[PDB]
Amino acid sequence: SMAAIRKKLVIVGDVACGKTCLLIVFSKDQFPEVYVPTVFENYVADIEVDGKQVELALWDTAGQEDYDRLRPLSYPDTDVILMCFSIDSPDSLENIPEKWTPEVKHFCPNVPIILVGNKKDLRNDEHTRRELAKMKQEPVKPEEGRDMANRIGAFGYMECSAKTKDGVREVFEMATRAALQA
Amino acid sequence: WSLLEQLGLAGADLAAPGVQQQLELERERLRREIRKELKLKEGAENLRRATTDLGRSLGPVELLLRGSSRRLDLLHQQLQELHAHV
Numbered sequence A: 001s002m003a004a005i006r007k008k009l010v011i012v013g014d015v016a017c018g019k020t021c022l023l024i025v026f027s028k029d030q031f032p033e034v035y036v037p038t039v040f041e042n043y044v045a046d047i048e049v050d051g052k053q054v055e056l057a058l059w060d061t062a063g064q065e066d067y068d069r070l071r072p073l074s075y076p077d078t079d080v081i082l083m084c085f086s087i088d089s090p091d092s093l094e095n096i097p098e099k100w101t102p103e104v105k106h107f108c109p110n111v112p113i114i115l116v117g118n119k120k121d122l123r124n125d126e127h128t129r130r131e132l133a134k135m136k137q138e139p140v141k142p143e144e145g146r147d148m149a150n151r152i153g154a155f156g157y158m159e160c161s162a163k164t165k166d167g168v169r170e171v172f173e174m175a176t177r178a179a180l181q182a
Numbered sequence B: 001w002s003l004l005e006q007l008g009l010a011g012a013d014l015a016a017p018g019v020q021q022q023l024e025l026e027r028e029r030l031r032r033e034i035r036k037e038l039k040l041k042e043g044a045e046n047l048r049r050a051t052t053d054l055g056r057s058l059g060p061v062e063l064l065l066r067g068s069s070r071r072l073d074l075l076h077q078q079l080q081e082l083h084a085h086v
């Protein structure tokens, strides 16, 4: 039995938009009990798509501007990018074409990008509604995220909730398929 | 944890032919273990979803899923430890 195909995945996106929980929920089936801002971490996940076994390297990057210097060094041999934003933060969605896309395209032109809408469980969350209401806002819509996906020329657009594990497998199976076409 | 310590090969000459063959066998085993665990996990996810539609407790399945990812972790550490001595 041959070894699994190796592919490296890098995840980017705004501060606290749910990047780490997404990686851990998928690779360890655990929702991190405590929130700890990431500088840089890496994990290995195992997956099989279309009868092909793949060993996915999960490179976790920092959303914080404080660690912008470190992020570029995590780009080099990336097979697929999971560019994230949170469904409960329209500002995190606005930083997609503003900050994340320009950075990713510069360091990884041609690398498949999956735009991911995190925290899908907060769309109908009443508390989220009242808070966003103050700031004269409301949770991101599926159409808006799908539009932004088209705008940055992403491989696809997916929504998920690391919390309820809803849409998590779909996100990673699509990311793996993209990373395989390479 | 060390697979070398488990096999009593701790301070042995790992470059020797016999040891090199035993390790290749162990790597093959590990690779097979990882593939089996990977499929059990994917199946467990299917069950978790099936249990969700039945309206029953996901606790047992979630625990199995975690135990499965934890096992994959150990298998990867050991496989990594043997790649250094090929």
Ligand SMILES: Nc1nc2c(ncn2[C@@H]2O[C@H](COP(=O)(O)OP(=O)(O)OP(O)(O)=S)[C@@H](O)[C@H]2O)c(=O)[nH]1
Pocket: A013, A014, A015, A016, A017, A018, A019, A020, A021, A022, A035, A036, A037, A038, A039, A061, A062, A063, A064, A118, A119, A120, A121, A122, A160, A161, A162, A163, A164
């Ligand atoms: N409601 C809900 N909260 C989530 C979800 N995923 C993450 N969170 C919460 O949002 C916060 C940030 O999550 P985390 O994954 O650590 O962000 P991050 O993007 O990795 O953050 P950074 O390291 O760039 S500063 C945490 O308190 C976490 O529990 C989700 O699907 N639903």
Ligand SMILES: [Mg+2]
Pocket: A019, A020, A036, A037, A038, A060, A061, A062, A063
């Ligand atoms: Mg993080």
